[PDB]
Design an enzyme around this catalytic site. Structure first.
Site, short mmCIF file in Angstrom:
data_model
loop_
_atom_site.label_atom_id
_atom_site.label_comp_id
_atom_site.label_asym_id
_atom_site.label_seq_id
_atom_site.Cartn_x
_atom_site.Cartn_y
_atom_site.Cartn_z
CD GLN A 57 -2.93 -0.74 -0.45
OE1 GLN A 57 -3.24 -1.72 -1.11
NE2 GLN A 57 -3.18 0.49 -0.86
CD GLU A 94 -6.06 0.95 -14.94
OE1 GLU A 94 -5.62 1.06 -16.10
OE2 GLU A 94 -6.36 -0.16 -14.44
C1 LIG Z 1 -5.21 0.48 -6.38
C2 LIG Z 1 -4.96 -0.80 -5.62
C3 LIG Z 1 -5.01 -2.04 -6.26
N1 LIG Z 1 -4.80 -3.15 -5.54
C4 LIG Z 1 -4.79 -4.46 -6.17
C5 LIG Z 1 -6.14 -5.06 -6.48
C6 LIG Z 1 -5.82 -5.81 -7.77
O1 LIG Z 1 -5.43 -7.14 -7.44
C7 LIG Z 1 -4.63 -5.12 -8.41
C8 LIG Z 1 -5.02 -4.22 -9.58
O2 LIG Z 1 -6.35 -3.75 -9.34
P1 LIG Z 1 -7.03 -2.47 -10.02
O3 LIG Z 1 -6.43 -1.19 -9.53
O4 LIG Z 1 -8.54 -2.48 -9.85
O5 LIG Z 1 -6.64 -2.60 -11.56
P2 LIG Z 1 -7.21 -3.71 -12.56
O6 LIG Z 1 -6.27 -3.71 -13.74
O7 LIG Z 1 -7.27 -5.08 -11.96
O8 LIG Z 1 -8.64 -3.08 -12.93
P3 LIG Z 1 -9.38 -3.14 -14.38
O9 LIG Z 1 -9.71 -4.59 -14.66
O10 LIG Z 1 -10.63 -2.32 -14.21
O11 LIG Z 1 -8.54 -2.60 -15.50
O12 LIG Z 1 -4.07 -4.30 -7.40
C9 LIG Z 1 -4.52 -3.12 -4.15
O13 LIG Z 1 -4.33 -4.20 -3.53
N2 LIG Z 1 -4.47 -1.94 -3.52
C10 LIG Z 1 -4.66 -0.79 -4.17
O14 LIG Z 1 -4.61 0.30 -3.55
MG LIG Z 2 -6.43 -2.30 -15.48
#
Ligand SMILES: Cc1cn([C@H]2C[C@H](O)[C@@H](COP(=O)(O)OP(=O)(O)OP(=O)(O)O)O2)c(=O)[nH]c1=O
Ligand SMILES: [Mg+2]
Ligand SMILES: Cc1cn([C@H]2C[C@H](O)[C@@H](COP(=O)(O)OP(=O)(O)OP(=O)(O)O)O2)c(=O)[nH]c1=O
Ligand SMILES: [Mg+2]
Lengths: 197, 197
Positions: free
Chosen positions: B70, B93
Protein backbone atom coordinates in the site's frame (compact mmCIF):
# COMPACT_ATOMS: atom_id res chain seq x y z
CA UNK A 1 10.22 23.50 -7.65
CA UNK A 2 10.33 21.32 -4.53
CA UNK A 3 8.13 21.59 -1.45
CA UNK A 4 9.60 23.91 1.24
CA UNK A 5 12.29 25.08 -1.25
CA UNK A 6 13.65 28.51 -0.25
CA UNK A 7 11.70 28.56 3.04
CA UNK A 8 14.48 27.23 5.25
CA UNK A 9 17.31 28.84 7.25
CA UNK A 10 20.88 27.60 7.69
CA UNK A 11 20.34 24.11 9.12
CA UNK A 12 22.47 21.91 11.39
CA UNK A 13 21.90 18.17 11.78
CA UNK A 14 23.00 16.49 15.02
CA UNK A 15 24.02 12.92 14.27
CA UNK A 16 25.64 9.96 16.03
CA UNK A 17 24.95 6.49 17.35
CA UNK A 18 22.04 5.68 19.68
CA UNK A 19 23.20 6.95 23.07
CA UNK A 20 25.89 9.26 21.62
CA UNK A 21 24.36 12.24 23.44
CA UNK A 22 22.49 14.03 20.63
CA UNK A 23 19.68 15.24 22.90
CA UNK A 24 22.17 16.20 25.66
CA UNK A 25 24.20 18.28 23.19
CA UNK A 26 21.08 20.07 21.86
CA UNK A 27 19.84 20.76 25.40
CA UNK A 28 22.54 23.44 25.81
CA UNK A 29 20.89 25.39 22.98
CA UNK A 30 17.50 25.45 24.74
CA UNK A 31 17.91 28.77 26.59
CA UNK A 32 18.12 30.17 23.04
CA UNK A 33 14.68 28.87 21.92
CA UNK A 34 13.88 32.46 20.98
CA UNK A 35 16.61 32.67 18.30
CA UNK A 36 17.03 29.07 17.16
CA UNK A 37 14.58 26.48 15.85
CA UNK A 38 15.36 23.30 17.81
CA UNK A 39 13.72 20.05 16.76
CA UNK A 40 14.80 17.48 19.33
CA UNK A 41 14.08 13.94 20.60
CA UNK A 42 11.98 12.70 17.59
CA UNK A 43 11.82 9.27 19.28
CA UNK A 44 8.84 10.48 21.37
CA UNK A 45 6.73 10.61 18.18
CA UNK A 46 7.69 7.00 17.30
CA UNK A 47 6.83 5.71 20.78
CA UNK A 48 3.29 7.11 20.49
CA UNK A 49 1.69 7.18 17.06
CA UNK A 50 -1.84 8.05 18.20
CA UNK A 51 -1.45 5.45 20.95
CA UNK A 52 0.68 2.95 19.02
CA UNK A 53 4.28 2.36 20.08
CA UNK A 54 6.00 1.62 16.76
CA UNK A 55 9.45 1.59 18.42
CA UNK A 56 8.27 -1.17 20.77
CA UNK A 57 6.65 -3.16 17.93
CA UNK A 58 9.75 -2.87 15.73
CA UNK A 59 12.18 -4.30 18.35
CA UNK A 60 9.77 -7.09 19.32
CA UNK A 61 9.06 -8.14 15.72
CA UNK A 62 11.40 -6.48 13.15
CA UNK A 63 10.49 -8.78 10.21
CA UNK A 64 6.92 -7.41 10.31
CA UNK A 65 7.28 -3.94 11.91
CA UNK A 66 10.69 -2.63 10.76
CA UNK A 67 9.08 -1.49 7.50
CA UNK A 68 6.20 0.55 8.90
CA UNK A 69 8.53 1.89 11.65
CA UNK A 70 11.17 3.17 9.20
CA UNK A 71 8.51 4.59 6.87
CA UNK A 72 7.15 6.56 9.83
CA UNK A 73 10.68 7.70 10.83
CA UNK A 74 11.11 8.91 7.27
CA UNK A 75 7.87 10.90 7.50
CA UNK A 76 8.63 12.58 10.86
CA UNK A 77 12.12 13.61 9.65
CA UNK A 78 10.51 15.07 6.52
CA UNK A 79 8.04 16.96 8.70
CA UNK A 80 10.94 18.43 10.69
CA UNK A 81 13.15 19.11 7.64
CA UNK A 82 10.30 21.00 6.00
CA UNK A 83 8.81 22.65 9.11
CA UNK A 84 8.35 26.43 8.65
CA UNK A 85 10.40 28.75 10.87
CA UNK A 86 11.07 32.50 10.99
CA UNK A 87 14.46 31.94 12.63
CA UNK A 88 17.96 32.28 11.20
CA UNK A 89 19.05 28.94 12.59
CA UNK A 90 17.54 25.47 12.68
CA UNK A 91 19.17 22.57 14.51
CA UNK A 92 17.70 19.05 14.24
CA UNK A 93 18.37 15.85 16.11
CA UNK A 94 18.69 13.24 13.34
CA UNK A 95 17.80 13.56 9.66
CA UNK A 96 16.28 11.62 6.75
CA UNK A 97 19.88 10.71 5.82
CA UNK A 98 20.71 8.66 8.94
CA UNK A 99 17.39 6.82 8.72
CA UNK A 100 18.32 5.87 5.15
CA UNK A 101 22.09 5.31 5.24
CA UNK A 102 22.42 3.73 8.68
CA UNK A 103 19.17 2.25 10.00
CA UNK A 104 17.42 1.16 6.79
CA UNK A 105 20.69 -0.18 5.33
CA UNK A 106 21.50 -2.13 8.52
CA UNK A 107 18.02 -3.65 8.62
CA UNK A 108 18.44 -4.71 5.01
CA UNK A 109 21.73 -6.44 5.93
CA UNK A 110 20.34 -8.21 9.02
CA UNK A 111 17.20 -9.30 7.12
CA UNK A 112 14.68 -7.28 9.19
CA UNK A 113 13.75 -5.70 5.85
CA UNK A 114 13.19 -8.17 3.00
CA UNK A 115 14.11 -6.94 -0.49
CA UNK A 116 10.55 -5.78 -1.29
CA UNK A 117 10.37 -3.71 1.92
CA UNK A 118 13.81 -2.27 1.26
CA UNK A 119 12.95 -1.44 -2.36
CA UNK A 120 9.74 0.37 -1.34
CA UNK A 121 11.61 2.53 1.19
CA UNK A 122 14.34 3.26 -1.39
CA UNK A 123 11.86 4.27 -4.11
CA UNK A 124 10.32 6.66 -1.55
CA UNK A 125 13.76 8.20 -0.81
CA UNK A 126 14.30 8.80 -4.52
CA UNK A 127 10.92 10.50 -5.01
CA UNK A 128 11.45 12.60 -1.86
CA UNK A 129 14.77 13.85 -3.30
CA UNK A 130 13.05 15.09 -6.49
CA UNK A 131 9.93 16.49 -4.78
CA UNK A 132 10.84 17.78 -1.31
CA UNK A 133 13.62 20.23 -0.37
CA UNK A 134 15.85 19.03 2.48
CA UNK A 135 18.00 21.90 3.82
CA UNK A 136 21.37 20.73 5.16
CA UNK A 137 24.31 23.10 5.71
CA UNK A 138 26.14 21.41 8.58
CA UNK A 139 26.21 17.99 10.25
CA UNK A 140 27.69 17.72 13.73
CA UNK A 141 28.77 14.12 14.26
CA UNK A 142 28.99 13.02 17.90
CA UNK A 143 31.51 10.20 17.46
CA UNK A 144 31.47 7.51 20.17
CA UNK A 145 32.60 3.96 20.80
CA UNK A 146 29.86 1.26 20.77
CA UNK A 147 30.78 0.36 24.39
CA UNK A 148 30.13 3.97 25.43
CA UNK A 149 26.88 4.16 23.42
CA UNK A 150 25.82 0.90 25.09
CA UNK A 151 26.32 2.12 28.69
CA UNK A 152 24.33 5.32 28.02
CA UNK A 153 21.51 3.25 26.48
CA UNK A 154 21.37 1.08 29.61
CA UNK A 155 21.52 4.07 31.98
CA UNK A 156 18.70 5.89 30.16
CA UNK A 157 16.84 2.56 30.25
CA UNK A 158 14.15 2.87 27.54
CA UNK A 159 12.04 -0.30 27.92
CA UNK A 160 12.06 -0.72 24.10
CA UNK A 161 15.89 -0.72 24.02
CA UNK A 162 16.41 -3.24 26.86
CA UNK A 163 17.27 -5.96 24.31
CA UNK A 164 19.54 -3.93 22.01
CA UNK A 165 22.81 -5.92 21.69
CA UNK A 166 26.32 -4.40 21.51
CA UNK A 167 26.84 -5.99 18.06
CA UNK A 168 23.89 -3.98 16.68
CA UNK A 169 25.52 -0.76 17.96
CA UNK A 170 28.84 -1.85 16.43
CA UNK A 171 27.04 -2.32 13.09
CA UNK A 172 25.42 1.13 13.32
CA UNK A 173 28.70 2.75 14.46
CA UNK A 174 30.55 1.58 11.33
CA UNK A 175 27.65 2.83 9.17
CA UNK A 176 27.90 6.29 10.72
CA UNK A 177 31.67 6.09 9.98
CA UNK A 178 31.07 5.06 6.36
CA UNK A 179 28.68 8.00 5.90
CA UNK A 180 30.27 10.80 7.94
CA UNK A 181 34.01 10.00 7.81
CA UNK A 182 34.67 7.88 4.70
CA UNK A 183 32.10 9.52 2.38
CA UNK A 184 30.76 6.22 1.08
CA UNK A 185 27.31 7.81 0.69
CA UNK A 186 26.31 10.41 -1.99
CA UNK A 187 25.01 13.12 0.38
CA UNK A 188 27.55 15.91 1.00
CA UNK A 189 27.72 19.06 3.13
CA UNK A 190 30.09 20.21 5.92
CA UNK A 191 30.74 17.68 8.71
CA UNK A 192 32.18 18.72 12.09
CA UNK A 193 33.42 15.73 14.11
CA UNK A 194 33.29 15.81 17.94
CA UNK A 195 34.47 13.24 20.51
CA UNK A 196 31.49 12.34 22.68
CA UNK A 197 33.22 9.57 24.67
CA UNK B 1 3.33 26.10 -2.42
CA UNK B 2 3.00 22.33 -2.84
CA UNK B 3 5.05 20.18 -5.16
CA UNK B 4 3.56 20.15 -8.71
CA UNK B 5 1.17 23.05 -7.94
CA UNK B 6 0.28 24.93 -11.16
CA UNK B 7 1.97 22.32 -13.37
CA UNK B 8 -1.07 20.15 -14.10
CA UNK B 9 -3.77 20.20 -16.83
CA UNK B 10 -7.42 19.19 -16.45
CA UNK B 11 -7.13 15.73 -14.93
CA UNK B 12 -9.52 12.77 -15.25
CA UNK B 13 -9.38 9.77 -12.89
CA UNK B 14 -10.78 6.39 -13.90
CA UNK B 15 -12.10 4.39 -10.99
CA UNK B 16 -13.95 1.19 -10.26
CA UNK B 17 -13.64 -2.22 -8.75
CA UNK B 18 -10.97 -4.74 -9.70
CA UNK B 19 -12.06 -6.14 -13.05
CA UNK B 20 -14.44 -3.24 -13.77
CA UNK B 21 -12.67 -2.35 -17.04
CA UNK B 22 -10.61 0.77 -16.31
CA UNK B 23 -7.81 -0.16 -18.77
CA UNK B 24 -10.33 -1.32 -21.39
CA UNK B 25 -12.05 2.06 -21.07
CA UNK B 26 -8.72 3.92 -21.34
CA UNK B 27 -7.83 1.94 -24.51
CA UNK B 28 -10.45 3.99 -26.35
CA UNK B 29 -8.23 7.07 -25.96
CA UNK B 30 -5.09 5.39 -27.34
CA UNK B 31 -5.41 7.04 -30.77
CA UNK B 32 -5.50 10.48 -29.11
CA UNK B 33 -2.31 9.74 -27.09
CA UNK B 34 -0.33 12.57 -28.74
CA UNK B 35 -2.72 15.14 -27.28
CA UNK B 36 -3.78 13.35 -24.07
CA UNK B 37 -1.44 12.26 -21.29
CA UNK B 38 -2.57 8.70 -20.57
CA UNK B 39 -1.34 6.86 -17.46
CA UNK B 40 -2.70 3.33 -17.51
CA UNK B 41 -2.32 -0.05 -15.82
CA UNK B 42 -0.20 0.89 -12.72
CA UNK B 43 -0.40 -2.73 -11.49
CA UNK B 44 2.56 -3.52 -13.78
CA UNK B 45 4.83 -1.39 -11.54
CA UNK B 46 3.57 -3.24 -8.43
CA UNK B 47 4.17 -6.64 -10.03
CA UNK B 48 7.85 -5.75 -10.62
CA UNK B 49 9.76 -3.44 -8.28
CA UNK B 50 13.25 -4.29 -9.53
CA UNK B 51 12.22 -7.95 -9.82
CA UNK B 52 10.17 -8.08 -6.62
CA UNK B 53 6.46 -8.87 -7.16
CA UNK B 54 4.87 -6.82 -4.36
CA UNK B 55 1.33 -7.71 -5.52
CA UNK B 56 2.06 -11.44 -5.24
CA UNK B 57 3.61 -11.07 -1.78
CA UNK B 58 0.69 -8.97 -0.48
CA UNK B 59 -1.80 -11.69 -1.54
CA UNK B 60 0.26 -14.60 -0.15
CA UNK B 61 0.92 -12.83 3.18
CA UNK B 62 -1.21 -9.64 3.72
CA UNK B 63 -0.48 -9.31 7.49
CA UNK B 64 3.18 -8.75 6.55
CA UNK B 65 3.08 -7.33 3.03
CA UNK B 66 -0.11 -5.24 2.75
CA UNK B 67 1.67 -2.31 4.44
CA UNK B 68 4.73 -2.00 2.15
CA UNK B 69 2.50 -2.79 -0.86
CA UNK B 70 0.00 0.00 0.00
CA UNK B 71 2.95 2.35 0.66
CA UNK B 72 4.33 1.61 -2.85
CA UNK B 73 0.87 1.94 -4.41
CA UNK B 74 0.68 5.39 -2.78
CA UNK B 75 4.10 6.32 -4.21
CA UNK B 76 3.36 5.24 -7.79
CA UNK B 77 0.00 7.09 -7.79
CA UNK B 78 1.83 10.17 -6.56
CA UNK B 79 4.43 9.77 -9.35
CA UNK B 80 1.60 9.72 -11.91
CA UNK B 81 -0.38 12.58 -10.29
CA UNK B 82 2.67 14.86 -10.35
CA UNK B 83 4.23 13.72 -13.60
CA UNK B 84 4.97 16.69 -15.91
CA UNK B 85 3.16 17.01 -19.22
CA UNK B 86 2.71 19.65 -21.93
CA UNK B 87 -0.63 18.16 -22.93
CA UNK B 88 -3.96 19.82 -22.08
CA UNK B 89 -5.60 16.68 -20.75
CA UNK B 90 -4.42 13.99 -18.34
CA UNK B 91 -6.33 10.74 -17.78
CA UNK B 92 -5.22 8.27 -15.07
CA UNK B 93 -6.21 4.74 -14.14
CA UNK B 94 -6.80 4.85 -10.35
CA UNK B 95 -5.64 7.52 -7.90
CA UNK B 96 -4.22 7.99 -4.40
CA UNK B 97 -7.87 8.34 -3.28
CA UNK B 98 -9.04 4.79 -4.03
CA UNK B 99 -5.88 3.32 -2.54
CA UNK B 100 -6.64 5.33 0.63
CA UNK B 101 -10.49 5.19 0.83
CA UNK B 102 -11.11 1.66 -0.56
CA UNK B 103 -8.06 -0.63 -0.28
CA UNK B 104 -6.47 0.63 2.93
CA UNK B 105 -9.90 0.92 4.58
CA UNK B 106 -10.68 -2.71 3.65
CA UNK B 107 -7.27 -4.09 4.64
CA UNK B 108 -7.61 -2.45 8.07
CA UNK B 109 -11.13 -3.82 8.53
CA UNK B 110 -10.09 -7.37 7.62
CA UNK B 111 -7.03 -7.14 9.87
CA UNK B 112 -4.40 -7.31 7.11
CA UNK B 113 -3.20 -3.93 8.41
CA UNK B 114 -2.64 -3.54 12.14
CA UNK B 115 -3.45 -0.17 13.78
CA UNK B 116 0.25 0.76 13.68
CA UNK B 117 0.46 0.12 9.91
CA UNK B 118 -2.86 1.89 9.34
CA UNK B 119 -1.72 4.90 11.42
CA UNK B 120 1.55 5.11 9.47
CA UNK B 121 -0.20 5.17 6.07
CA UNK B 122 -2.72 7.77 7.32
CA UNK B 123 0.03 10.04 8.68
CA UNK B 124 1.64 9.83 5.23
CA UNK B 125 -1.69 10.63 3.51
CA UNK B 126 -2.06 13.69 5.74
CA UNK B 127 1.43 14.98 4.95
CA UNK B 128 1.04 14.28 1.21
CA UNK B 129 -2.09 16.44 1.25
CA UNK B 130 -0.05 19.32 2.76
CA UNK B 131 3.02 18.92 0.61
CA UNK B 132 2.08 17.49 -2.79
CA UNK B 133 -0.46 18.77 -5.30
CA UNK B 134 -2.92 16.20 -6.63
CA UNK B 135 -4.88 17.50 -9.65
CA UNK B 136 -8.42 16.07 -9.82
CA UNK B 137 -11.16 17.60 -11.99
CA UNK B 138 -13.35 14.63 -12.86
CA UNK B 139 -13.74 11.07 -11.77
CA UNK B 140 -15.28 8.54 -14.15
CA UNK B 141 -16.77 5.71 -12.10
CA UNK B 142 -17.14 2.38 -13.91
CA UNK B 143 -19.84 0.95 -11.69
CA UNK B 144 -20.16 -2.81 -11.68
CA UNK B 145 -21.78 -5.50 -9.60
CA UNK B 146 -19.29 -7.49 -7.51
CA UNK B 147 -20.39 -10.62 -9.39
CA UNK B 148 -19.49 -9.27 -12.80
CA UNK B 149 -16.11 -7.98 -11.50
CA UNK B 150 -15.44 -11.50 -10.17
CA UNK B 151 -16.16 -13.07 -13.59
CA UNK B 152 -13.77 -10.63 -15.32
CA UNK B 153 -11.04 -11.29 -12.75
CA UNK B 154 -11.41 -15.03 -13.32
CA UNK B 155 -11.37 -14.64 -17.13
CA UNK B 156 -8.18 -12.49 -17.02
CA UNK B 157 -6.57 -14.92 -14.56
CA UNK B 158 -3.70 -12.91 -13.04
CA UNK B 159 -1.89 -15.55 -10.96
CA UNK B 160 -1.67 -13.06 -8.04
CA UNK B 161 -5.47 -12.78 -8.03
CA UNK B 162 -6.14 -16.56 -8.11
CA UNK B 163 -7.34 -16.66 -4.48
CA UNK B 164 -9.47 -13.45 -4.51
CA UNK B 165 -13.00 -14.37 -3.30
CA UNK B 166 -16.32 -12.72 -4.29
CA UNK B 167 -16.66 -11.42 -0.67
CA UNK B 168 -13.49 -9.28 -1.06
CA UNK B 169 -14.92 -7.70 -4.23
CA UNK B 170 -18.28 -7.11 -2.49
CA UNK B 171 -16.37 -5.35 0.31
CA UNK B 172 -14.50 -3.10 -2.20
CA UNK B 173 -17.66 -2.43 -4.15
CA UNK B 174 -19.43 -0.91 -1.13
CA UNK B 175 -16.34 1.18 -0.36
CA UNK B 176 -16.37 2.53 -3.94
CA UNK B 177 -20.10 3.28 -3.48
CA UNK B 178 -19.46 4.96 -0.11
CA UNK B 179 -16.91 7.32 -1.69
CA UNK B 180 -18.27 7.91 -5.19
CA UNK B 181 -22.04 7.50 -4.72
CA UNK B 182 -22.81 8.43 -1.09
CA UNK B 183 -19.88 10.87 -0.89
CA UNK B 184 -18.87 10.04 2.65
CA UNK B 185 -15.24 11.07 1.83
CA UNK B 186 -13.45 14.53 1.72
CA UNK B 187 -13.37 16.05 -1.84
CA UNK B 188 -13.83 14.03 -5.06
CA UNK B 189 -14.61 16.66 -7.67
CA UNK B 190 -17.52 15.74 -9.95
CA UNK B 191 -18.25 12.04 -10.49
CA UNK B 192 -19.63 10.66 -13.76
CA UNK B 193 -21.17 7.22 -13.15
CA UNK B 194 -21.14 4.57 -15.88
CA UNK B 195 -22.78 1.14 -15.96
CA UNK B 196 -19.81 -1.14 -16.71
CA UNK B 197 -21.85 -4.37 -16.49
C1 LIG C 1 -5.21 0.48 -6.38
C2 LIG C 1 -4.96 -0.80 -5.62
C3 LIG C 1 -5.01 -2.04 -6.26
N1 LIG C 1 -4.80 -3.15 -5.54
C4 LIG C 1 -4.79 -4.46 -6.17
C5 LIG C 1 -6.14 -5.06 -6.48
C6 LIG C 1 -5.82 -5.81 -7.77
O1 LIG C 1 -5.43 -7.14 -7.44
C7 LIG C 1 -4.63 -5.12 -8.41
C8 LIG C 1 -5.02 -4.22 -9.58
O2 LIG C 1 -6.35 -3.75 -9.34
P1 LIG C 1 -7.03 -2.47 -10.02
O3 LIG C 1 -6.43 -1.19 -9.53
O4 LIG C 1 -8.54 -2.48 -9.85
O5 LIG C 1 -6.64 -2.60 -11.56
P2 LIG C 1 -7.21 -3.71 -12.56
O6 LIG C 1 -6.27 -3.71 -13.74
O7 LIG C 1 -7.27 -5.08 -11.96
O8 LIG C 1 -8.64 -3.08 -12.93
P3 LIG C 1 -9.38 -3.14 -14.38
O9 LIG C 1 -9.71 -4.59 -14.66
O10 LIG C 1 -10.63 -2.32 -14.21
O11 LIG C 1 -8.54 -2.60 -15.50
O12 LIG C 1 -4.07 -4.30 -7.40
C9 LIG C 1 -4.52 -3.12 -4.15
O13 LIG C 1 -4.33 -4.20 -3.53
N2 LIG C 1 -4.47 -1.94 -3.52
C10 LIG C 1 -4.66 -0.79 -4.17
O14 LIG C 1 -4.61 0.30 -3.55
MG1 LIG D 1 -6.43 -2.30 -15.48
C1 LIG E 1 16.66 7.51 13.49
C2 LIG E 1 16.28 6.08 13.81
C3 LIG E 1 16.21 5.65 15.13
N1 LIG E 1 15.88 4.36 15.39
C4 LIG E 1 15.76 3.91 16.77
C5 LIG E 1 17.09 3.62 17.47
C6 LIG E 1 16.75 3.98 18.91
O1 LIG E 1 16.19 2.83 19.55
C7 LIG E 1 15.67 5.05 18.84
C8 LIG E 1 16.21 6.47 19.01
O2 LIG E 1 17.55 6.48 18.47
P1 LIG E 1 18.33 7.84 18.13
O3 LIG E 1 17.82 8.44 16.83
O4 LIG E 1 19.81 7.57 17.97
O5 LIG E 1 17.95 8.86 19.32
P2 LIG E 1 18.53 8.76 20.83
O6 LIG E 1 17.71 9.63 21.73
O7 LIG E 1 18.55 7.34 21.35
O8 LIG E 1 19.99 9.41 20.63
P3 LIG E 1 20.80 10.18 21.80
O9 LIG E 1 20.94 9.23 22.96
O10 LIG E 1 22.15 10.49 21.20
O11 LIG E 1 20.08 11.41 22.26
O12 LIG E 1 15.09 4.92 17.54
C9 LIG E 1 15.59 3.43 14.35
O13 LIG E 1 15.29 2.24 14.62
N2 LIG E 1 15.64 3.82 13.07
C10 LIG E 1 15.96 5.09 12.74
O14 LIG E 1 16.02 5.42 11.54
MG1 LIG F 1 17.94 11.48 21.93
Amino acid sequence: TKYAEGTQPFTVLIEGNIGSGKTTYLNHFEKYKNDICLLTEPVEKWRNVNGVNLLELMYKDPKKWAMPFQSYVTLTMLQSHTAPTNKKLKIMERSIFSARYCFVENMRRNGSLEQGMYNTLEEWYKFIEESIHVQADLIIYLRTSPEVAYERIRQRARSEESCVPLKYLQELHELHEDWLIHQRRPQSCKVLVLDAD
